[PDB]
């Protein structure tokens, strides 16, 4: 089993901690969802290759521009996260997270991930967004952003329903293997 490293980056309420918890537990926490994520080493087997995948979060470091880059050394794949119920989090991707991720992690594959895709069919979400002259992030808007930032690919998921969560991490493993 080769050891590869994954780091998930993104704004505060993009659901990156929830995504890492749901994958590292295999199910959605039925009693209590932890506030924090320490680390986890995944035993993923993708396309016949056995890989050990270290999972790391950057939650709580978005305000500390000198502590944050310390999660980047030896990163093999970057999960660039945004929330589908927050068009503003997608707007910050090209001008805040992309310049930093490319500076500290050159030549490292970035997968743009749209979290909370379930909320695209949530009435409260569509009403709350409409009051601020907005709507949930469309699939083509997310795809266009990955195209623009030079991302390796674009994926969507929902940690609440576990839908697409496994495919993101199996694809992140594939991306980390490419040399």
């Amino acid at each position: 089993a080769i050891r590869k490293k994954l780091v998930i980056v993104g704004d505060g309420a993009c659901g990156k901690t929830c995504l890492l918890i749901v994958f590292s537990k295999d199910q959605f926490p039925e009693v209590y969802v932890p506030t924090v994520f320490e680390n986890y080493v995944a035993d993923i087997e993708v396309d016949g290759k056995q890989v050990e995948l270290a999972l790391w979060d950057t939650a709580g470091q978005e305000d500390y521009d000198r502590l944050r880059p310390l999660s980047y050394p030896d990163t093999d794949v970057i999960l660039m996260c945004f929330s589908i119920d927050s068009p503003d989090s997608l707007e910050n991707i090209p001008e805040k997270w992309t310049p930093e991720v490319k500076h500290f992690c050159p030549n490292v594959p970035i997968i743009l991930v749209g979290n909370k895709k379930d909320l695209r069919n949530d009435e409260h979400t569509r009403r709350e967004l409409a009051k601020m002259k907005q709507e949930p992030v469309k699939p083509e808007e997310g795809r266009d952003m990955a195209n623009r930032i030079g991302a390796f690919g674009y994926m969507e998921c929902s940690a609440k329903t576990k839908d697409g969560v496994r495919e993101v991490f199996e694809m992140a493993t594939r991306a980390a293997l490419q040399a």
Binding site: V36, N39, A54, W56, G60, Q61, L67, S71
Partner: peptide
Amino acid sequence: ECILLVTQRITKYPL
């Protein structure tokens, strides 16, 4: 892993 776990610890407290 131990070094990054220690570095990230301080940023967990506010959450």
